[PDB]
Amino acid sequence: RINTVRGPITISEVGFTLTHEHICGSSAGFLRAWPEFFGSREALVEKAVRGLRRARAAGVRTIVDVSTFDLGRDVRLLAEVSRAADVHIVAATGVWLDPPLSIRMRSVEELTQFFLREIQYGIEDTGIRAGIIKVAITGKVTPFQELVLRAAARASLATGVPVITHTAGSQRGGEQQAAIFESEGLSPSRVCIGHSDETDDLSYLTALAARGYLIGLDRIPHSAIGLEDNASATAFMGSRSWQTRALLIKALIDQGYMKQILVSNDWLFGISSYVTNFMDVMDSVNPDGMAFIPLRVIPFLREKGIPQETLAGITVTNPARFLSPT
């Protein structure tokens, strides 16, 4: 069974899953301290519900919010929006790239306990339990990031809950992360190497896939083509077309690794951790939001000749095998 913000669900209920999304990209405590940054908490809720409903209609039944403590994860916000939109939402524990001092001063043993509290007992005082662990690195894994990766591994081994990662920028850190995970004894089938669509290095992708890693092709709609004049847009969404990103799905299918692919939008409905009004920039690029995958991508892959059954297998079977604890 899989933990959601509304409680436990069966594999069968999971359905069509977007495994890499956010309701809001922020910082710990920020939404509670300055809700007016988003207009109001009430507007943010309405926008998230009006978006999750358009995706639900397009077939989406589950999303995984990979927002950690330090990404401003507000679990009560997740519950409100999930219940209102009637779409499953899996919450995360772990540590992203903006840990405050109270997190970054902690040991591997302490960080392990923290992830365990959030998976086994609940997030804050809510009883809502994390379904996944999200970690991140920059360039070469820093000493602190190594502690986080090791703690994430130990937590996964204790609870069966999977791990999702990424490396800042377009850097290909999967091999370095994979090395640390395996030194802890973690099975690659419990790990997704995320943001893998930031690169066109197919040898890199296939090799990880061949080892059993899930390949997170999850920023498909991100593209600053047309926004060349907006330097902050480029740094965030890149210069590669969404088509180029989506073709990596085909390419990996064509190598026989369909069972290892996870597809998503890495979207959200508010963001405060970047430049002001960046949400409006993203919205002007991908008006379909979280519906971009079921609506505009699936047909694309359908057109290029991928069998419907293979897609269903990627959008339903894969997420379920991934999310289901072991």
Contact between 276 and a second copy by CB under 8 A: the answer reads yes
Contact between 124 and a second copy by CB under 8 A: the answer reads yes
Count Cβ neighbours within 10 Å for each residue of 254-274 and write b for 16 or more, e otherwise: eeebbebbbbbbbbbbbbbbe
Number of residues that bind a second copy (CB under 8 A): 34
The residue (of 105 and 179) whose beta carbon lies closer to a second copy is: 105
Q: Of 275, 296, 317, 325, which one interacts with a second copy (CB under 8 A)?
A: 275
Q: Which listed range, 112-120, 166-174, 197-205, 225-233, lies at the site for Zn ion (CB under 5 A)? A: 166-174
Site string for a second copy, 54-93 (x = CB under 8 A): ---------------xx-x---------------------
Interaction partner, residue 266 (Zn ion, a second copy, none; CB < 5-8 Å by kind): Zn ion
Q: Of 10, 107, 183, 243, which one interacts with a second copy (CB under 8 A)?
A: 107
Tell how many helices (H) and how many strands (E) occur in the chain: 16, 13
CB of 179 closer than 8 Å to CB of 157: no
Radius of gyration (C-alpha) of the chain in whole angstroms: 18
Query: According to the 3-state scheme, what is the secondary structure of 263-323?
Result: ECCCCCCEECCCCCCHHHHHHHHCCCHHHHHHHHHHHHHHHCCCCHHHHHHHHHHHHHHHH
Q: Of 22, 56, 61, 106, which one interacts with a second copy (CB under 8 A)?
A: 106
Residue 54: alpha-carbon gap to chain centroid:
19
Q: How many other CB atoms sit within 10 Å of the CB of residue 190?
A: 22
The residue (of 26 and 165) whose beta carbon lies closer to a second copy is: 26
Contact between 198 and Zn ion by CB under 5 A: the answer reads no
Task: Enumerate residues 38-57 that contact Zn ion by CB under 5 A.
Answer: none
The residue (of 232 and 317) whose beta carbon lies closer to a second copy is: 232
Q: Which listed range, 101-109, 155-163, 173-181, 300-308, lies at the site for a second copy (CB under 8 A)? A: 101-109
Contact between 117 and a second copy by CB under 8 A: the answer reads yes
DSSP state of 137: B
State whether residue 254 is helix, strand or coil: coil
Q: Of 114, 213, 267, 292, which one interacts with a second copy (CB under 8 A)?
A: 114
CB of 216 closer than 8 Å to CB of 19: yes
Task: Enumerate residues 18-37 that contact a second copy by CB under 8 A.
Answer: 26-30, 32-34, 36-37
Contact between 245 and Zn ion by CB under 5 A: the answer reads no
- The least distance separating Zn ion from the CB of residue 264, rounded to whole angstroms, comes to 8
Residue of 31, 93, 26 whose CA lies nearest to 64: 93
Count Cβ neighbours within 10 Å for each residue of 282-307 and write b for 16 or more, e otherwise: bbebbebbbbbbbbbbbebbeeeebe
Q: Which listed range, 107-115, 143-151, 246-254, 260-268, lies at the site for a second copy (CB under 8 A)? A: 107-115
The residue (of 33 and 202) whose beta carbon lies closer to a second copy is: 33
Contact between 166 and Zn ion by CB under 5 A: the answer reads yes
Instruction: List interacting residues with Zn ion (CB under 5 A).
Output: 166, 266
Instruction: List interacting residues with a second copy (CB under 8 A).
Output: 26-30, 32-34, 36-37, 69-70, 72, 98, 100-103, 105-107, 110, 113-114, 117-118, 123-125, 272-276
